[PDB]
Amino acid sequence: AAHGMEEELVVISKSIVNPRSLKKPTSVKKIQLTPWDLSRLRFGYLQRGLLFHKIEVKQLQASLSVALDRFYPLAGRLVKLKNDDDTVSFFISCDGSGVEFVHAVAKNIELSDVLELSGSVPGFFASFFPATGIKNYHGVSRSLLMVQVTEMKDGVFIGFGYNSTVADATSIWKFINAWSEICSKDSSGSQTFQRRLHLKGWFFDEIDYPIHIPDPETKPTSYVTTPTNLQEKMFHVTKENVLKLDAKANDEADQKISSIQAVLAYIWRSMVKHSGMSREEETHCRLPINMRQRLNPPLEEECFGNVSQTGIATVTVGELLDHGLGWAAMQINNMELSQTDEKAKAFAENWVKNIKIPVSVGSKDLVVTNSHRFDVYCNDFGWGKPIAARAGPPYLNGRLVVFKGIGEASLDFQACLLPQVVEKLVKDAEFNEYVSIV
Amino acid sequence: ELVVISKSIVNPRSLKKPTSVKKIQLTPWDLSRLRFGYLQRGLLFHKIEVKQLQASLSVALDRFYPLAGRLVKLKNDDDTVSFFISCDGSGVEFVHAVAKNIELSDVLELSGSVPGFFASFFPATGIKNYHGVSRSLLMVQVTEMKDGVFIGFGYNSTVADATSIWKFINAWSEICSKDSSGSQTFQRRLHLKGWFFDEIDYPIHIPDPETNLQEKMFHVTKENVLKLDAKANDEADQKISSIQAVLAYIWRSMVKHSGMSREEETHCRLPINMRQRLNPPLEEECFGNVSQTGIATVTVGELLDHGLGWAAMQINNMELSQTDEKAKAFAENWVKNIKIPVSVGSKDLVVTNSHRFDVYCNDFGWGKPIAARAGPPYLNGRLVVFKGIGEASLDFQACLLPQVVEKLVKDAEFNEYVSIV
Numbered sequence: 001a002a003h004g005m006e007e008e009l010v011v012i013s014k015s016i017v018n019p020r021s022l023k024k025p026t027s028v029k030k031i032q033l034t035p036w037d038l039s040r041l042r043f044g045y046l047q048r049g050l051l052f053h054k055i056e057v058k059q060l061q062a063s064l065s066v067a068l069d070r071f072y073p074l075a076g077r078l079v080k081l082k083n084d085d086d087t088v089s090f091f092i093s094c095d096g097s098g099v100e101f102v103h104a105v106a107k108n109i110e111l112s113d114v115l116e117l118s119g120s121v122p123g124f125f126a127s128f129f130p131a132t133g134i135k136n137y138h139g140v141s142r143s144l145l146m147v148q149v150t151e152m153k154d155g156v157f158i159g160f161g162y163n164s165t166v167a168d169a170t171s172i173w174k175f176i177n178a179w180s181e182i183c184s185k186d187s188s189g190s191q192t193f194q195r196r197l198h199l200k201g202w203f204f205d206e207i208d209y210p211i212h213i214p215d216p217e218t219k220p221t222s223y224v225t226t227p228t229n230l231q232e233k234m235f236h237v238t239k240e241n242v243l244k245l246d247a248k249a250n251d252e253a254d255q256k257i258s259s260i261q262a263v264l265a266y267i268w269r270s271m272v273k274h275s276g277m278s279r280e281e282e283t284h285c286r287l288p289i290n291m292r293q294r295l296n297p298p299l300e301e302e303c304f305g306n307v308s309q310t311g312i313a314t315v316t317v318g319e320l321l322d323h324g325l326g327w328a329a330m331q332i333n334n335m336e337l338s339q340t341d342e343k344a345k346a347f348a349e350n351w352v353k354n355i356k357i358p359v360s361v362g363s364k365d366l367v368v369t370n371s372h373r374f375d376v377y378c379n380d381f382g383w384g385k386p387i388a389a390r391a392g393p394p395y396l397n398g399r400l401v402v403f404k405g406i407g408e409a410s411l412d413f414q415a416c417l418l419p420q421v422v423e424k425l426v427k428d429a430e431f432n433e434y435v436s437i438v
Numbered sequence: 439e440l441v442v443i444s445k446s447i448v449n450p451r452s453l454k455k456p457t458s459v460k461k462i463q464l465t466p467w468d469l470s471r472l473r474f475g476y477l478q479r480g481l482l483f484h485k486i487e488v489k490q491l492q493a494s495l496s497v498a499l500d501r502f503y504p505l506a507g508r509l510v511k512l513k514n515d516d517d518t519v520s521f522f523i524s525c526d527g528s529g530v531e532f533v534h535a536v537a538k539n540i541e542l543s544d545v546l547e548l549s550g551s552v553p554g555f556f557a558s559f560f561p562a563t564g565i566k567n568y569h570g571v572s573r574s575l576l577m578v579q580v581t582e583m584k585d586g587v588f589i590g591f592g593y594n595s596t597v598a599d600a601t602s603i604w605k606f607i608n609a610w611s612e613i614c615s616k617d618s619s620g621s622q623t624f625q626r627r628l629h630l631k632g633w634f635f636d637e638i639d640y641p642i643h644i645p646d647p648e649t650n651l652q653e654k655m656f657h658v659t660k661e662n663v664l665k666l667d668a669k670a671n672d673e674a675d676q677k678i679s680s681i682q683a684v685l686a687y688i689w690r691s692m693v694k695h696s697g698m699s700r701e702e703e704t705h706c707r708l709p710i711n712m713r714q715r716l717n718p719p720l721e722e723e724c725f726g727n728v729s730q731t732g733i734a735t736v737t738v739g740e741l742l743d744h745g746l747g748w749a750a751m752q753i754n755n756m757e758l759s760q761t762d763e764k765a766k767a768f769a770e771n772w773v774k775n776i777k778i779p780v781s782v783g784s785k786d787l788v789v790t791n792s793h794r795f796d797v798y799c800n801d802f803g804w805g806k807p808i809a810a811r812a813g814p815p816y817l818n819g820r821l822v823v824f825k826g827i828g829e830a831s832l833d834f835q836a837c838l839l840p841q842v843v844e845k846l847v848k849d850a851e852f853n854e855y856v857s858i859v
Contacts, residue, residue, distance in 0.1 A: 053806070110828070110829045111827065111828045111829060112659070112660040112826075112828030112829045112830060112831055115827065115828050115831075116659050116660060116661055116828070116831075118660075118661060153829075154829060236859075238543065238547040238549075238859060239541075239543040239544070239547060240547065240549065380805070384801070384805050384806055385484070385805055385806075387827060405543065406542065406546060406808055407541065407542040407543025407544075407546045407547065408541055408542060408543060408585055409541060409543040410543050410546070410547065426854070427850070429848070429850070432853060433847070436657075436857050436858075436859060437857070438657075438659060438857065
């Protein structure tokens with residue numbers, strides 16, 4: 001960290017990285033957007049990143065070209081059509097427009113600043129991500145994937161932002177795995193097996209595309225947000241404590257509760273306990289759901305695209321605090337269970353007809369993002385595995401990014417909370433018994 | 439449990455024994471530890487291939503040939519005995535084993551009663567230094583895990599200190615990284631420490647040398663390390679180092695929950711590399727045991743009644759105390775009034791290893807290690823220091839009484855600066 005109020009970030013270059021292919025691509029494929037994708041058009045790009053001891057920018061960029069040739073949708077652009085019925089529609093044109101690639105240097109930032117998230121929000125770390133402020137419908141003129149490699153005093157950070165309409169976290173991490181593999185072996189891709197990309201396709205039989213929707217450019221606001229200062233903290237849960245929380249939750253639960261469910265419920269209760277909310281207030285836990293294996297027929301984890309949804313468990317603060325860990329875990333589990341193919345199909349068909357169910361969320365929710373199932377440490381670009389995975393902006397109170405620990409059986413969380421709540425958690429003896437706050 | 443797949447003796451690659459075998463004489467430091475057990479440390483990895491590890495070890499032993507030698511015990515005419523090191527190339531014990539039910543998280547999050555499952559990952563458990571007459575001066579065990587590999591090693595403190603063992607590990611990892619066969623490896627010649635006590639004859643004549651502890655990992659962020667450094671340099675007249683401040687804080691907090699009487703004497707023992715402190719100084723790359731234990735002594739009353747800066751200054755004064763003259767006097771003393779203990783220290787803070795060693799530079803070719811750990815023997819108050827992954831973070835492997843552990847977890851201020859895993 002640099003001394004003073006200002007941190008130096010020098011942008012060494014900004015360029016467009018186009019795919020590379022051996023073979024001749026003849027046609028421009030089009031990917032149609034489902035109601036899931038269209039509902040997220042006004043959301044901001046999702047931003048994540050990996051920390052390394054060493055990265056060679058030249059080889060990284062070269063390998064990125066090949067990886068983009070293989071994951072071609074990430075190199076395309078959104079196309080917006082104006083229909084004759086006053087509506088608009090959107091699709092993805094896989095035209096190889098390319099990916100925005102930024103090379104920057106933060107000479108005074110070191111590994112420990114990123115490992116410990118030493119500042120406040122936005123602080124220095126926000127600058128490490130290239131898609132801050134970009135909304136998904138900006139993909140008509142901005143790349144669907146943006147990459148920023150930032151040289152640090154003693155390391156290198158690779159941050160990326162991606163357009164939700166083109167991929168979910170699963171597909172993005174598959175892309176990162178392939179990119180790393182390519183960079184490790186040979187940057188030209190000669191020595192890395194090329195595989196055909198299996199796209200999610202269109203699983204909404206009774207919905208025609210493109211879907212006509214009101215122009216989002218003139219659409220009124222849907223959500224209300226209240227700006228505030230926030231603080232990020234890293235939480236670590238050891239194998240031993242994960243298992244203790246699992247045992248306790250299943251001891252108080254009627255249904256079988258997963259380890260991750262138990263830990264998430266514990267963190268949810270502990271945050272609500274110190275949030276200062278009143279008992280009658282509503283609190284929610286928001287959870288990403290990979291629908292690939294829920295759909296009928298089911299798709300494989302290899303399927304490319306956004307096949308994910310957000311499930312929401314709703315309770316009152318009083319309910320959550322008056323009940324035990326098992327009860328909150330059961331709330332999460334029930335919310336997860338209720339995501340079915342029939343209901344997804346019905347809700348999409350209704351959404352097309354403007355028959356919707358308003359999502360009710362609060363400013364004090366637990367907003368779980370990422371997944372303990374992603375192996376973030378397999379992303380060795382050729383100079384060693386990363387030493388950490390991190391999330392970037394945008395920020396909001398209650399965000400909890402889940403990362404599989406270095407040890408298979410452990411968990412890391414990047415939490416975004418009010419400074420007062422962090423202060424209260426730091427002083428919570430029981431919470432610090434089970435969770436280690438960095 | 440744990441299954442041994444193979445056991446080997448690894449000799450130097452370019453083994454050429456000369457007309458005369460080189461002899462290394464042992465100083466009072468080396469001899470005072472003859473009764474102690476082998477020191478054992480290890481590195482955790484995602485992947486290690488054993489064949490290239492073995493070949494690179496053979497190559498590295500060409501340069502670090504003393505590690506392939508043996509202790510030799512002589513019976514003197516005055517009924518005393520003496521010891522020296524014969525660099526005869528006898529070889530290093532190399533054990534390949536498998537523990538399929540142990541995973542990375544178990545070793546990363548080391549915690550529990552000792553000795554436990556982890557003790558079996560180290561090859562020199564129960565071996566004393568004077569056993570070096572028939573056992574190798576360095577022993578290696580690579581234990582395959584469910585999802586990783588541990589390389590544990592034990593070494594005889596008569597032939598090397600932590601500094602030169604870690605430099606040997608660095609060289610070994612470099613060789614295995616870039617040329618495992620040694621086909622293309624040309625190594626600088628080893629510089630031995632030699633004899634720097636001219637008022638002492640060698641070989642020195644000596645008499646023949648022959649609790650439910652728990653282990654826990656502590657982590658100190660760069661954030662809290664700087665906080666402790668500042669809080670110590672505020673309460674101190676003399677410049678205090680970050681490590682001194684952190685050690686002093688851990689000392690006082692352990693003393694506070696030790697249940698000792700205010701009038702009891704407590705000590706902090708610290709390894710001191712004497713290479714630069716001897717007059718004339720020896721080269722930093724000098725191979726051998728050139729380290730001594732410095733001791734800071736206070737009353738439990740004195741320590742608890744003063745602040746962090748005072749304990750830090752005690753440690754710093756102890757360190758400033760470690761002069762050539764002092765080392766000169768200790769040696770002359772010891773040979774007239776020999777002292778070869780078996781322990782002495784279970785109510786002290788026994789700091790071992792050094793934040794100065796770069797744990798994570800030891801990439802053998804399949805990636806940097808994800809952790810460094812210590813093995814047996816176990817000793818109440820042992821505090822093994824490891825450089826953190828970051829720039830100024832610290833990791834500690836602590837052996838403590840269960841009752842002290844429980845008191846430490848409830849210590850709010852302690853957990854504010856120190857993360858107990």
